[PDB]
Amino acid sequence: KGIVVEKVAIEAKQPNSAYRKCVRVQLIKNGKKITAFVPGDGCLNFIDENDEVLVSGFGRSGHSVGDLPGVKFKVVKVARVSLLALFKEKKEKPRS
């Protein structure tokens, strides 16, 4: 569990063009800042600027994944609601 410090826009490696929406989170345990990936296009505005994210690994252990350089972690539940559940269809509660 960590808290969102800043919302960042990482640019891809050479063969692809996009701006990838990422989230800088400070883990509660150790006071460590890391950059985490957020799936889903509406999801950048599904986190507030001082919110609680539940962050996980990203399918590869510490290895960089796909386009993103330097991103080792992924957000999978926000405001203690599941990110995917909110995204998919709106099957579960919005932000309060």
């Binding site: 919302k7 826009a9 296009d41 509406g42 950048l44």
Partner: protein, 43 residues
Amino acid sequence: GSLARAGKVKNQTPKVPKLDKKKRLTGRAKKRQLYNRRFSDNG
């Protein structure tokens, strides 16, 4: 930063109602239907 164009495509697309349809089969019944549609009459 160039952040706030986010959510573009989902916002843009039309939204469609998901219709009715007669109950898709469970279980044995679904397996029997699959068996017929793949293997029986064909020839």
